Design a protein around this ligand. Structure first.
Ligand SMILES: Nc1ncnc2c1ncn2[C@@H]1O[C@H](COP(=O)(O)OP(=O)(O)OP(=O)(O)O)[C@@H](O)[C@H]1O
Ligand SMILES: Nc1ncnc2c1ncn2[C@@H]1O[C@H](COP(=O)(O)OP(=O)(O)O)[C@@H](O)[C@H]1O
Ligand SMILES: [Mg+2]
Lengths: 51, 69, 50, 386, 99
């Protein structure tokens, strides 16, 4: 943690609703999905979830 | 020469007589473990096309772990 | 090559605007001259007084 | 409600191709509404090369002021994209470089600059790292090919997309590729494969950049009634939940399908005339509207003759709501073509059905296709010798 | 993770592709990056992606003995891995703390 050793520290917070929706869109793309899946609702159904 | 692939094996497959007598009904109360093993071992063997159609990648291996006995 | 300039090359005068440019199992029956089936059915619907 | 937002980018807008085809038709050349919509799309997208092609092929009067304004807008936007690419290659990273080229290629495709769009898309693909981005570029090329009906482009990009989807297990892209392939098979009279792909993607359709879902279901039904057997049509289309749900809003298509399935042959013939007038105006079904309809007629005739040993000509005419002479001519034409397994006793006006073995029908196709392949082999050897 | 993508880009992509930017700025090019967050948030995913897009060799240092034979028969110091990394420069040495 001394300055100059790590030139940049980047935080990876757990995804919010929109980031969870993006991750859901990325990972459900590998599946035979019926048309009209409300991935937004499923993202809202996963509070405090990781990728 | 090239030997047949099934030949030259110090380890043999289980014959009919070597099959254990333990049934699924003999095992009591491991429905979760039975379901996971079936979905990861015995179902992909017979339903690999279904796994491909759905988009699931069948697990190559299964690690069964827990306390002894 | 010994191209056949002896024979009179009739002028092309064709349509270079992709007249057909298709790859099917095309058959002669599509080229039968006739009005559309809609016109035939319309002309025979009233032939019975309907 | 977010259906259309799910689809791929609408470049090129296939509605533009449909309207251009409509204007190519002699019946609808002077339609003011079609011309107005096409001109509105051209003006909004500033399609200078497409405007040139439109006025050249259709022999229109080029609005000099409009053309100059659209060309100036195109030049300024191209200069801006070139500046963005130049900034990216010196300061930003490879991802931003690829983004700048993707913007340039998208603009070139949007304005109808087909060759420049292809060149820019090839350049962008050459240094695109993400597999899905490469597959999106391939879908862009497929859409461009469908826009101009470029068979070579469509086939090459379909093979490339199949390979890319095999590499990365993207089932969504697989469904989109199935939809595109079904559209192409419709374009090239391959109704069996088109029906198969459409039925596979009837419950996963998201390609709203190609067509509306209602239009997709209508196309699926149209190809299914010509490419499917009666049990397959019953199981997949007649009892299909999604297809029936869509057909609830399409009374004409449901009537057309069920009249054939329920053997309401006069209703089926009327719906077939309506469907024919629909196909004539569709740029995908226009080359085959004469073929498709004829085949459908044969199907109807075959169906009416499938279960009966013999049928009087009057009964056939009454069932189809046409004259006896019309039935005579149609049946004679289709029997002479070898498509109907029956013979007409015109003396008593009785159509007697036949049951020719599948061996003869396999042998005739074997002769035909073997002769085609033999001609290919002969001409290939002819090329080889000299 | 667009913000994280940009942040890791400015530190790992720019020094490899454009050292002249840092030389003109008169600052030392970054050499160490920390990615901190709950498990499963994409730290390894973003590290692998940034190694993949910049054509930088991605080396994962788990400290496992199973791979030690590949690192070197000595194995007395972890810096013995550097000989491999220098052979595949540009390189990204990645280590994930399980904790
Ligand atoms: N669910 C169960 N129902 C009935 N018997 C059980 C059950 N689970 C374990 N047993 C008993 O466990 C005994 C043998 O243990 P088992 O070999 O299955 O354990 P293990 O997990 O393989 O053990 P270890 O880790 O020591 O190898 C059998 O005699 C069997 O009766
Ligand atoms: N933000 C994200 N977007 C997409 N996928 C993610 C994201 N975060 C995690 N994943 C998925 O989770 C899996 C494991 O995550 P990983 O990156 O190993 O977590 P960590 O950041 O703790 O190392 C990866 O295969 C990745 O596909
Ligand atoms: Mg992790």
């Amino acid at each position: 943690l001394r300055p100059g050793r790590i030139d940049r520290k980047i935080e990876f917070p757990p995804p919010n609703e929109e980031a969870r929706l993006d991750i859901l869109k990325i990972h459900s793309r590998k599946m035979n999905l019926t048309r009209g899946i409300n991935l937004r609702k499923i993202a809202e159904l996963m509070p405090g979830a990781s990728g | 020469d090239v030997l047949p692939p099934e030949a030259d094996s110090s380890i043999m497959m289980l014959t009919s007589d070597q099959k254990p007598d333990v049934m699924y009904a003999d095992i009591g109360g491991m429905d979760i473990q039975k379901q996971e093993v079936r979905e990861a071992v015995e179902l992909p063997l017979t339903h690999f096309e279904l796994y491909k159609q759905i988009g699931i990648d069948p697990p190559r291996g299964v690690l069964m772990y827990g306390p002894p006995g | 090559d010994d191209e056949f300039e002896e024979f009179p090359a009739e002028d092309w005068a064709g349509l270079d605007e992709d007249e057909d440019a298709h790859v099917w199992e095309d058959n002669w029956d599509d080229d039968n001259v006739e009005d559309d089936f809609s016109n035939q059915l319309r002309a025979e619907l009233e032939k019975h007084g309907y | 409600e977010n259906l259309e937002e799910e689809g791929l980018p609408k470049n090129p807008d296939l509605r533009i191709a449909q309207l251009r085809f409509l204007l190519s038709l002699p019946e609808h050349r002077g339609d003011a509404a079609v011309r107005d919509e096409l001109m509105a799309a051209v003006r909004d997208n500033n399609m200078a090369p497409y405007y040139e092609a439109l006025c050249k092929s259709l022999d229109w009067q080029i609005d000099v002021d409009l053309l100059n304004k659209m060309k100036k807008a195109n030049e300024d936007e191209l200069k801006r994209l070139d500046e963005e690419l130049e900034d990216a290659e010196k300061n930003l990273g490879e991802s931003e470089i690829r983004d700048a080229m993707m913007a340039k290629a998208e603009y070139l495709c949007r304005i109808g600059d087909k060759e420049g769009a292809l060149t820019a898309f090839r350049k962008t693909y050459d240094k695109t790292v993400a597999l899905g981005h490469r597959l999106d570029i391939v879908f862009y090329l497929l859409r461009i090919g469908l826009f101009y009906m470029d068979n070579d482009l469509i086939t090459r990009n379909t093979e490339k997309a199949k390979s890319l989807i095999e590499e990365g297990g993207d089932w969504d892209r697989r469904n989109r590729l199935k939809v595109y392939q079904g559209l192409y098979c419709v374009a090239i009279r391959d109704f069996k494969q088109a029906a198969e792909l459409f039925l596979d993607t009837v419950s996963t359709f998201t390609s709203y950049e190609l067509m509306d879902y209602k239009t997709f279901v209508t196309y699926t039904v149209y190809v299914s009634m010509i490419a499917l057997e009666r049990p397959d049509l019953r199981e997949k289309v007649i009892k299909g939940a999604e297809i029936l749900e869509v057909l609830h809003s399409l009374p004409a298509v449901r009537q057309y399908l069920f009249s054939l399935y329920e053997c309401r042959y006069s209703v089926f013939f009327q719906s077939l005339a309506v469907v024919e007038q629909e196909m004539k105006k569709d740029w995908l079904f226009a080359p085959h509207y004469r073929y498709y309809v004829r085949e459908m007629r044969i199907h109807a005739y075959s169906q009416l003759l499938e279960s009966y040993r013999s049928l009087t000509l009057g009964y056939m005419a009454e069932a189809f709501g046409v004259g006896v002479e019309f039935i005579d001519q149609e049946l004679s034409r289709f029997i002479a073509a070898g498509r109907l397994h029956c013979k007409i006793d015109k003396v008593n006006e009785i159509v007697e059905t036949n049951r020719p073995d599948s061996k003869n029908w396999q042998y005739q196709e074997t002769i035909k296709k073997g002769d085609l392949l033999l001609n290919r082999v002969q001409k290939l050897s002819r090329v080889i010798n000299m | 993770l667009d913000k994280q993508i940009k942040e890791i880009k400015e530190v790992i992509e720019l020094p490899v592709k454009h050292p002249e930017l840092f030389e003109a700025l008169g600052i030392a090019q970054p050499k160490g990056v920390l990615l901190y967050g709950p498990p499963g948030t994409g730290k390894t995913l973003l590290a692998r992606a940034v190694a993949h897009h910049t054509d930088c060799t991605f080396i994962r240092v788990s400290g496992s003995e199973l791979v030690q034979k590949f690192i070197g028969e000595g194995a007395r110091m972890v810096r013995e891995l550097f000989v491999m990394a220098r052979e595949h420069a540009p390189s990204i040495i990645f280590m994930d703390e399980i904790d």
